[PDB]
């Protein structure tokens, strides 16, 4: 029986899914299954934990927004049905750009923590990485904690370290495969929830 990992926590949690062909279609299903497992362990509500789910390729698609006032069961259904892209490129810079200038353009919930879970399995072409550091620093200034999850041997290690070295909060998780997500799930959620503040008594 599932239990609320973030109980009494105030958190905006953003899931960023690598949409490149570095993940097979089945592997991408495992990634999505991970996201759903995560959501199952959260109390999704505007008053507690809010979620966002974005799949990024050369561009990005936001399947779920933080303000989307749909029932949790619906949000989890949407996440599990995110379409496989299998794009040649997954632009981390573009999706961090979207996270900075769209999702967190306005901080309407300052009393909550903001966490961006960047699930990476690829490495964007260098020409697309010109403004990467700027987006990462912009997110830091808005008190958005970016947590990189490097999956597989093709994950952009340089960018993972660039995010990690900013602050101890930006702890990076490294996995050899999507298959390892389930085993490290509870650890990851616990780390996330530990960063989130509690509601006052
Ligand atoms: Ca492979």
UniProtKB/Swiss-Prot annotation:
It comes from the Eukaryota. Disulfide bonds join 7-193. Residues 12-188 form the VWFA domain. This is von Willebrand factor. It comes from Homo sapiens (Human).
């Amino acid at each position: 029986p599932l239990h609320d990992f973030c109980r009494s926590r105030l958190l905006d949690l953003v899931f960023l899914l690598d949409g490149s062909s570095r993940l097979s279609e089945a592997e991408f299903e495992v990634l999505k299954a991970f996201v759903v497992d995560m959501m199952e362990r959260l109390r999704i509500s505007q008053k507690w934990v809010r979620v966002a789910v974005v799949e990024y390729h050369d561009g990005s698609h936001a399947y779920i927004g933080l303000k989307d006032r749909k029932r949790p069961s619906e949000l989890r259904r949407i996440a599990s049905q995110v379409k496989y892209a299998g794009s040649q490129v997954a632009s981390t810079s573009e999706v961090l750009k979207y996270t900075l200038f769209q999702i967190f353009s306005k901080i309407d919930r300052p009393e909550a923590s903001r966490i961006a879970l960047l699930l990476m399995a690829s490495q964007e072409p260098q020409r697309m990485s010109r403004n990467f550091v700027r987006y990462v620093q912009g997110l830091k200034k808005k008190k958005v904690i970016v947590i990189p999850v490097g999956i597989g041997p093709h994950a952009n290690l340089k960018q993972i370290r660039l995010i990690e070295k900013q602050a101890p909060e930006n702890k990076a998780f490294v996995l050899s495969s999507v298959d390892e997500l389930e085993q490290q799930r509870d650890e990851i959620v616990s780390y996330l929830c530990d960063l989130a503040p509690e509601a006052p008594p």
